[PDB]
Each structure stands twice: as structure tokens, then as C-alpha cells.
Amino acid sequence: AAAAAAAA
Amino acid sequence: AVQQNKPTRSKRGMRRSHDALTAVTSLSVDKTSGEKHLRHHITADGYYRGRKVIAK
Amino acid sequence: METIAKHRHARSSAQKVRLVADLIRGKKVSQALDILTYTNKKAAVLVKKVLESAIANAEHNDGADIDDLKVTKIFVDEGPSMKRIMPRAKGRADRILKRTSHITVVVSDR
Amino acid sequence: MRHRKSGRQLNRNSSHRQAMFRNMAGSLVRHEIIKTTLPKAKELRRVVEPLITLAKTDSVANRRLAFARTRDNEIVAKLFNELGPRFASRAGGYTRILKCGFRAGDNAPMAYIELVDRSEKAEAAAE
Amino acid sequence: GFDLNDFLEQLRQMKNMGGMASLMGKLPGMGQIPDNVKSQMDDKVLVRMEAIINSMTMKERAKPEIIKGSRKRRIAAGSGMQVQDVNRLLKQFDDMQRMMKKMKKGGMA
RNA sequence: AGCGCAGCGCGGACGCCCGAACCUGGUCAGAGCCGGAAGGCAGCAGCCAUAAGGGAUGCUUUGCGGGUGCCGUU
RNA sequence: GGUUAAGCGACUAAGCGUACACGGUGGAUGCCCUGGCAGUCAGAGGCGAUGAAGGACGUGCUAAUCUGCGAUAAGCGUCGG
RNA sequence: CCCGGCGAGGGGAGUGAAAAAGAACCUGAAACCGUGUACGUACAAGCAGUGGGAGCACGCUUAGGCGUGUGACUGCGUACC
RNA sequence: AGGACCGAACCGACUAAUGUUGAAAAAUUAGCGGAUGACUUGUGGCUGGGGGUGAAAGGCCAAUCAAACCGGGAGAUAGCU
RNA sequence: CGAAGGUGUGCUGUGAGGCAUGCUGGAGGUAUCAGAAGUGCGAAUGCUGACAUAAGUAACGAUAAAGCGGGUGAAAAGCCCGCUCGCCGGAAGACCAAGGGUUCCUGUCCAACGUUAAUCGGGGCAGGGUGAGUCGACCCCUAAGGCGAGGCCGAAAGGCGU
RNA sequence: GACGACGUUGAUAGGCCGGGUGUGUAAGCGCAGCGAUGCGUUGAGCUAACCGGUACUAAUGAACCGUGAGGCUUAACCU
Ligand SMILES: [Mg+2]
Ligand SMILES: [Mg+2]
Ligand SMILES: [Mg+2]
Ligand SMILES: [Mg+2]
Ligand SMILES: [Mg+2]
Ligand SMILES: [Mg+2]
Ligand SMILES: [Mg+2]
Ligand SMILES: [Mg+2]
Ligand SMILES: [Mg+2]
Ligand SMILES: [Mg+2]
Ligand SMILES: [Mg+2]
Ligand SMILES: [Mg+2]
Ligand SMILES: [Mg+2]
Ligand SMILES: [Mg+2]
Ligand SMILES: [Mg+2]
Ligand SMILES: [Mg+2]
Ligand SMILES: [Mg+2]
Ligand SMILES: [Mg+2]
Ligand SMILES: [Mg+2]
Ligand SMILES: [Mg+2]
Ligand SMILES: [Mg+2]
Ligand SMILES: [Mg+2]
Ligand SMILES: [Mg+2]
């Protein structure tokens, strides 16, 4: 989920 | 309590005399070579010399 | 412009702000605070902001890093005043003009 | 004022001043420092220190106020167990004041009062 | 509880695929051309951003509100980028600290 | 009562430690630049060493100040 | 020229005023009309149970409001330019 | 690009013949409100000017007795409709 | 039983202070009168201006009443200001 | 190679005014002699608008007063969390009708609006949100009263009514 | 606003010690009484703006404004 936010 | 002719100019411009603001003048205290505010030691840490508010 | 900043609107009336301004002139500059930071009146918090913005324009429009300067000018002007109404004695004593000003700070050479 | 020595008040009911001043008094004991006007401050210590002196007793006397000046006997218990024996030495004096000043919106002095550790006198460094 | 030191690690932890098949598919409803604009060959900016951070001191990486023109004209001199390039990183980072503070459990709704 | 010493204290060297994001140096990933290649140039973070400038301490040298200790001398 | 007297004695502006400089406020003035305001000439003098005038509500790729239009809904057919 | 609260507001840079055209936007007057400078001004009574008038600040001229501002002191002297 | 007694709700307004550019274009505070009655109240209906309604004061008929409000005759007339 | 207009100046006329020109200004103006007037303001408790004055004065709306520690934030007396404290409780609680017509909930933003500050709101901008065979309205029934085929009246309008 | 006192070379405020004063014999414990209650501890407990005293707390070291020998003329004193 870390990549689904920092990249979102 | 009504008034009648009143001179905006000159008059009032005279009462304003007693209305100008004023200046402080205070130190820095040993540690803070600046602030110290007024009769305080320093706000940076709120310490006169040590553990007072937050410091070392 | 010989590094200015001034203001417009916000709202703080003229005389109100014209009072704190008198406090600062002549030397100024290095007085970005103290002669201002140690006086609390709304008018003060407003002149300081623009004061710094002005002294900041000393790294963009012109050189002369912040340290010299003078602040040979500070004057506030009457800016458009907002109008509103006020319920009172059936509606007679109601005008209310919010009033507003600026500051227009300057910093030239001595 | 009128003519001589009387005093102690701020816009408030003396019927209620007791609370507006007791809760605050029990706070210093709960903590140490509390910013609250030079007035409330310069006025605060007369309820804190005088209630501090109730140490030597640590019996019925100290308990002249537990179930009253605070719903819970926390602050009071904290007294005859901690605060009382702490400053046992130089009885006189206790809480100090340090000007803060300016409360935002209504330019009123602040200060915050304190106790030992570095009061009007001083203290070491630790704890 | 967050800064450049932690944001940088998030870039190094991209060893495994780095999202070559993950983030590349985290957008079914592509906006005509959103994919390539994000990945950018995975080196057009994805790599530059890191380099710009590597040329930063422990102080700058800790405090982002202490960098001035004197520091911006230095990072670009070492990294090889420009002044506006270094500014973009700071801007995109400013919107990160504001987002990584207004949530709790996923932050979804 | 006056000095010379011991000593205390203090300042400057030496040894150790610490110590400038760039304008100090060496080494310099990532990145940048030149060329048709092969190969170089410039250079940041970090690491090591090292000035200006500090510190703990052992104490050689040493300017000056002390006047407690307290020999001798006028 | 040194003190002591006597006689005079301008320099200060908290502020105020006049003159000029520069601004602010404000919106007059000048300039301009796909808006009005008389009339000439020439038409036309009526629309409506084949459902009017006037609207409500809908109808666009989103679609708030006008303008259109009506569940065939910024339109459908057809002849002409 | 820079100050700022990722404000307001502004300062540069650029557009432009012009931004002393920046959206409050043509020209922008008056009342009214300021900053600056020259002079008058804190023992003097009143429609505040007018007549006389020294001084002061600038400007005069190959002096020649002047121009502009301001006006101490003084004779007069109760706005318009 | 009672247009009976005392007294909240509810209905009303005798007194004083305050308010009088109000909290308020009639109220607030402390008292005060009626409180099973010619009582009190919700909803809806009916009376229209020289007309209504009126336990009657010229009271009420939308903060308006010795003749409502709106539009018209209308630029009434004004030997007056 | 700068019209009208605005502002200064100089010359000129008895005066109403005339001209020349600095500056502003950004497009038009009009000798002359003649012609026609919405033809000339200081007042009418004149009309419209703008800005003064009083004056940074009164006032900030029930005397049920609040203190403190955290959080957030550019900033917190007022917002969120917590512990105290006080106020109402035939209510200052809860539900519904009338009336209102998104004020409801979430996220956001703080210009204007909140008689202050405002990160907060019944404010702005977004979204979301009211699910019935049994509750209500429709719907059967009729009251007061309204309307009223034909009808009776009445210059017309129209009144009354089976 | 002003005006007086004091700012560590200190009693100027607050606190603290003692006393005064005013209230009226606390709390707790013991005993009597079935109990209300009473008695003893006890003239206790509490106690303000007061009096005597005490630096415990706060009154910090500096900084600011105000200068640098005082116009001309004459008379009297002078070398
Ligand atoms: Mg009470
Ligand atoms: Mg015709
Ligand atoms: Mg303009
Ligand atoms: Mg004089
Ligand atoms: Mg004359
Ligand atoms: Mg009765
Ligand atoms: Mg009265
Ligand atoms: Mg009553
Ligand atoms: Mg009764
Ligand atoms: Mg009714
Ligand atoms: Mg009426
Ligand atoms: Mg007629
Ligand atoms: Mg008439
Ligand atoms: Mg013309
Ligand atoms: Mg006239
Ligand atoms: Mg005030
Ligand atoms: Mg007054
Ligand atoms: Mg007053
Ligand atoms: Mg209120
Ligand atoms: Mg709404
Ligand atoms: Mg809500
Ligand atoms: Mg809302
Ligand atoms: Mg009928």
C-alpha cells in the first residue's frame, strides 16, 4: 500500500 | 449632546498629539545576543540559565 | 521601483495602521522587528509582514544584501472601504464602513 | 483606592472566585507550570503555598481538604506524600513567576508560575 | 516522523521490479497517456530525483525548510540538473508530508 | 617592609580528540559533458587526512599575571 | 580677556497652518455605441378547439442559465437557395 | 523566479507601442485622506481677510534696490441667501 | 351545585424601576387580575370601505383608520412658503 | 512629428471669457459669418452618488462567570481531546405539526458572512444523504362554507340557487 | 497619567515563623445513655486586609534619553 499512496 | 459646526482639519489633528505610539528598549541578555524580549532572558528556549521551560 | 512592497485591502483601517508606521522610519531595516515585534496592535503584524517582503526584495530587484538599507519611506493611504448595514433603532443609525489601507514600505540609500 | 489595604479580585464573583482559583491551584500540584495572566498568577500562590504548608501534620490536619477541593483525593494525596516533604527545608516561599506576556487577541500578560526545581531560588539538574 | 532520509529509502527499495509491472498496471483507466508520463522510461526523472537527493547533506535531508538559493545552485551543480529541477522535487515533497499526516488506516475514505 | 624563587593561575606551541553545504585538498558511486570509437574533462553526497578555530587531560617549553606557600636576600 | 550684576537675547516644536512635490480615495469629464427615443414610405391588421396568448417541466458529450425544441425534444422529413 | 499561511498582497522577469493599459484595467477632475520640503507658530483674543509690513527659504541681475513661497508686528474690520 | 373560594398552566395588563439612537417600532424585572367560564386555544370558513365588525373607545379592518391599501382621473387646486 | 478632456504657466479683455504653451492624454476637433437651443446653479428641510464630522467615541444582545494540560495550526481565551467547574431539567431535554426548503452527513477552504480571532459554523465549493401493502397524503364520507346543468333575477358586468 | 516607598549595598509586594483578633471548645479517640444527645480530651479547632520578624519567591548585569565648561553690550571688581 506504500506504493499505492506515494505514487497515487 | 448634539454638536454644530466642527473643523475636521486642524482640530482633532491636535488631539492626535497625545495619540502617537511609543518605543521599548531592552537587552539581549548574556546568552541571546539579541532577542531577550523585554525584561525576559530569552524565548528561544525560555531559560534564564538552564532547565526553565525547555532547554538543555 | 527602489525596492518597495506595499499592500492593498486585507482591512485594518488607515489611522489604525498609520499609528504603528510612525514607530518605524529613519534607521529601520535592521529593525525588521523589535521596534515592531515588540508592539502588539493588529496594524503592527501587517506592517512587519510587508516590511520583510520589502527588505526581501533586496535580493531580487536590486542587490545590496539585507544589512544596510534605510527605509526612508512609510505611508498608508485610505483604501476602498466596504459598506454594510446595522440593525439598530428601527434602521436609522446604520452605516458601517470597514475601511482598509496598505503600508507601502521603502528601502533606499542613506 | 478608597483608603488603605484590602484587595484580591478580578472581574468575577467572589462566590465563584473560589473555583476559578481552586481548580487552577490543584493544577500546579498536578503539574508544575501553568501560563495564566500575571494577575491570576500573582494571585494564585496564596491558595497553593498556604495549602502546601499542610505537610508537618500529615494527619487529620492535612486532610482538612480532600473530599472537597477536588472530587478525587489525587492532588491532596500528592501533597502530604510528595509536595509536602519535597520543600520541607526553606518553608517560606515556593512558586515563582516568569513573565511570558501577550495572549493573542487580547494583549494580556501570561507568565505561568512554577515550583522548586528552579523557583525564585534555584535547583540542581537531574530527574 | 518523516523526511527526505525516509523518502530516499523508498527509492532504493525499488530494486525488485520497482513497479515495472506493478505501478505500470495500477491505472486500468489510463487517461489516454498517463502511464509513460509517470514511469518516463524509468530514468527520465525516476532516477534524477534520487541523484538530486544524494547530493544533499544530512541537514538538508532532515529539514526541507532550510534550503535557499545558495543550496539550490549547489545541488544542481553536482547532480547536473538545473535550479527549477531541484525546486520541483521540493514541491512534490511538500505535498507528501501533508498527505502522510492526514490518515490512519489506509486513508481510504 | 622591598625582591628573587617554589607554587597557583593564565596565554601561546607540541601530542590526542573534535572541527567549514560551496568558496580547502586527495579519493570520488549516481548524474553531466567531449568524440565515429577506444578513452578523458569537470564535479556533489559520503569516507579518510588535515588548517583557522575549541575541548578533556598528561604535562615539556614558554610570555605575563600573582603575593596563598613562604627559603634566602636588601 | 577672568567672575558678579543690569539690559536685552535668537535657537524648541507635542502639534497646528499656508505654498509647492508625490500619491491615495473617488468617480466627473472627453471620446464611443450591434441601446433607446419621432417619424417617412410601404406592408400587414389578427392567433385559438387542426387546441392559442402565456408558462411548468423536460431535452446537449458534462450541462448552471439564456436561446432553441418537445419523450421523433439546439431537433425529424421534403423542395428550393 | 522571490517574500508570504502552497493566503492576501506585492516585487522582478517577460507580453505589449504603451501594464504611468494587469483584469479595481481608457481619459481619470472635485470633495475627502496622507508623506516630504520652505516659512509662520506654545503670553495671545473675535467672519480669519484686506492695507501696511520686517524677517527667513530659494531665484535676480557685472549693485541697481526686484520675482516666488511664507508670513511676525500693525490700521481696519460681525459670512452668503 | 356554583359567570363560588385559594392557586400553577393558560388568558389578561393595575403599579414602580429600567429601557427611550432599546434586547424590543410597547418589552424586561418585581409585584398584579381571571383561572369550569359572557373562559381559553388550533385549523378552516363568512362579513369590504361611506362599507364591514364593534359588551361602544370612533375602537378594530395587515406597525395605516373622523372613512383601508394599490392603480388611475392627475402635472387635482394652492390669491401660500 | 499627438484632437477632445484634465492640469500648470504666460500674455490679453471692462467682464462674461480669449489665445499661446509646458505636462498629462489617446483619438478626433472646427476660424469665420449665419442658424437653432434640454443654453450657463450656491442655495429650493432640491434629486443621485462619493467622501467627511462626531471618533477610534458608544456599543459587541440577558450577570447560567470559568480554570488548566494536550492536539492541530502561520497564529488558539473561543476549534478537537481530556479532567475539573458552573447552568437548565413541566425544561435551556425528547418528539411532531405549522412554516422553512438542503439548513442534514463527509471532505475541504476562511475573501465576504459570524458585532472580535477563527484552524470553527446554519458561510463558500464539492460530493453523499432521506428506501413503506400496515405512518401520512392521495382515496371513500360528509361540516362551516364554496361552486353550481337547467332555473329565478338583474342596463352589461353579474347576484341567488335545485 | 500624576505622586510616595523599595529593587539583592534589599523588607517593596507575596509566602513563612510568632503574637494579636474574631469565632466559640474542631477532627479523632474514650466513656455515659436504647437513642437524640452529653462529658472528657479542650476554652479546642480554624482565623483577613493586622503587629513583630524572616530573603523563601519575585524585585537581574547592562541598555535608553540627557553632554563635552555656558550670546552680545555695559558697570563694578583684576594682572
Ligand atoms: Mg452562591
Ligand atoms: Mg402607415
Ligand atoms: Mg485609468
Ligand atoms: Mg512667541
Ligand atoms: Mg499689501
Ligand atoms: Mg370563579
Ligand atoms: Mg423613564
Ligand atoms: Mg410579570
Ligand atoms: Mg385565582
Ligand atoms: Mg383564523
Ligand atoms: Mg392597525
Ligand atoms: Mg383633470
Ligand atoms: Mg401637483
Ligand atoms: Mg465636442
Ligand atoms: Mg442664489
Ligand atoms: Mg479600543
Ligand atoms: Mg466625545
Ligand atoms: Mg468614556
Ligand atoms: Mg454575547
Ligand atoms: Mg447551502
Ligand atoms: Mg452540520
Ligand atoms: Mg455549510
Ligand atoms: Mg352561487
Side-chain angles (χ1 to χ4, degrees):
Chain B
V2 75
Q3 15 297 288
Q4 212 75 162
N5 42 233
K6 299 312 151 235
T8 170
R9 302 268 302 120
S10 193
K11 172 101 280 187
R12 190 276 116 154
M14 259 132 68
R15 195 210 102 59
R16 179 269 172 293
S17 294
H18 286 65
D19 303 329
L21 258 125
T22 69
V24 292
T25 10
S26 169
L27 269 102
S28 58
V29 113
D30 71 87
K31 283 121 190 185
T32 245
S33 304
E35 180 235 337
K36 156 164 190 119
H37 270 44
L38 213 72
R39 235 203 102 291
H40 190 226
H41 200 83
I42 168 181
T43 188
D45 308 58
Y47 67 98
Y48 188 98
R49 195 220 151 143
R51 270 59 105 242
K52 227 46 262 74
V53 192
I54 52 173
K56 278 136 175 174
Chain C
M1 284 150 258
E2 201 304 314
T3 156
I4 333 288
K6 36 196 276 61
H7 196 67
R8 255 292 154 205
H9 255 200
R11 165 189 140 261
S12 179
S13 121
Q15 72 186 290
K16 265 190 61 240
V17 308
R18 175 62 192 132
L19 231 56
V20 296
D22 293 292
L23 286 176
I24 57 169
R25 214 156 293 196
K27 301 74 181 185
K28 236 278 86 54
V29 188
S30 301
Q31 273 324 303
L33 290 314
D34 322 325
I35 183 161
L36 291 120
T37 211
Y38 293 137
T39 81
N40 198 312
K41 286 218 61 182
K42 225 182 75 150
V45 188
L46 327 173
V47 294
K48 149 177 57 64
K49 276 278 274 286
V50 55
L51 185 282
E52 311 174 319
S53 304
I55 190 55
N57 282 179
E59 248 313 324
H60 261 48
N61 185 76
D62 301 293
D65 49 24
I66 304 85
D67 32 60
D68 194 311
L69 270 333
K70 200 191 176 190
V71 181
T72 185
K73 305 225 295 176
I74 293 180
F75 51 88
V76 308
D77 293 54
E78 278 182 50
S81 181
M82 291 176 266
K83 183 120 185 178
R84 227 67 67 158
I85 307 175
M86 185 91 223
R88 250 227 189 62
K90 293 70 268 151
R92 198 73 194 288
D94 25 52
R95 228 188 320 207
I96 310 175
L97 311 198
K98 314 299 180 186
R99 292 186 179 290
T100 178
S101 74
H102 337 74
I103 173 60
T104 70
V105 181
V106 188
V107 281
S108 67
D109 73 58
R110 318 105 75 127
Chain D
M1 36 106 218
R2 287 156 51 79
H3 260 150
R4 182 87 161 162
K5 206 76 173 311
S6 34
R8 296 294 165 193
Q9 56 157 163
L10 33 110
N11 328 55
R12 200 156 296 191
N13 240 51
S14 289
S15 281
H16 298 53
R17 220 191 283 281
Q18 302 184 282
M20 324 272 251
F21 255 150
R22 71 147 61 162
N23 303 310
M24 172 160 118
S27 159
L28 302 83
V29 182
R30 202 168 281 281
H31 307 51
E32 172 200 296
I33 45 279
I34 55 291
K35 52 202 135 15
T36 174
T37 69
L38 277 172
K40 265 123 194 164
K42 211 166 294 151
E43 190 102 348
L44 182 49
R45 81 284 283 282
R46 313 153 67 63
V47 299
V48 218
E49 304 178 44
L51 261 68
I52 285 296
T53 54
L54 287 81
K56 270 294 166 193
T57 160
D58 203 291
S59 67
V60 283
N62 170 286
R63 279 56 146 181
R64 174 55 192 155
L65 229 28
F67 293 149
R69 263 273 163 69
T70 168
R71 185 163 186 168
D72 203 327
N73 300 199
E74 311 197 312
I75 197 283
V76 50
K78 165 80 70 179
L79 288 159
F80 71 81
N81 290 145
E82 286 177 46
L83 281 80
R86 289 169 76 137
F87 219 53
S89 186
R90 302 290 151 187
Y94 216 139
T95 66
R96 38 182 174 282
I97 316 297
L98 273 105
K99 105 282 307 84
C100 179
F102 286 50
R103 203 235 270 292
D106 43 299
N107 281 156
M110 304 318 295
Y112 55 15
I113 299 208
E114 195 180 317
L115 51 167
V116 73
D117 281 36
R118 183 218 258 141
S119 321
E120 72 137 336
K121 270 73 180 220
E123 178 133 350
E127 279 40 30
Chain E
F2 181 61
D3 57 302
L4 298 177
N5 295 60
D6 299 300
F7 181 61
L8 188 170
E9 300 180 60
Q10 300 180 60
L11 300 177
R12 297 181 179 180
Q13 298 180 60
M14 300 180 90
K15 299 289 74 180
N16 47 63
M17 77 180 90
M20 59 180 269
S22 300
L23 293 300
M24 181 180 90
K26 299 299 180 300
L27 39 60
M30 299 181 269
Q32 196 296 299
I33 183 177
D35 185 297
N36 55 61
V37 178
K38 180 179 180 60
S39 301
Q40 298 179 299
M41 191 62 90
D42 299 300
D43 58 59
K44 297 179 180 300
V45 179
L46 180 60
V47 180
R48 297 183 180 180
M49 297 179 88
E50 180 180 60
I52 301 178
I53 302 178
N54 298 302
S55 300
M56 301 179 90
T57 61
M58 301 300 95
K59 300 180 180 180
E60 300 180 300
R61 299 180 180 180
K63 299 181 180 180
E65 68 293 68
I66 64 177
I67 302 177
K68 301 299 180 300
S70 180
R71 300 179 180 297
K72 299 180 180 180
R73 299 179 296 82
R74 182 180 60 62
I75 302 178
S79 180
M81 300 299 95
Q82 300 300 299
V83 181
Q84 59 180 300
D85 298 59
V86 182
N87 180 60
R88 181 180 65 277
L89 188 169
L90 300 176
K91 181 61 181 180
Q92 299 180 300
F93 180 61
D94 180 60
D95 300 301
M96 180 60 90
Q97 60 180 60
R98 300 180 180 298
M99 181 180 89
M100 299 299 270
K101 182 180 179 180
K102 301 180 180 59
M103 67 299 100
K104 184 63 179 60
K105 298 297 181 181
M108 300 300 270

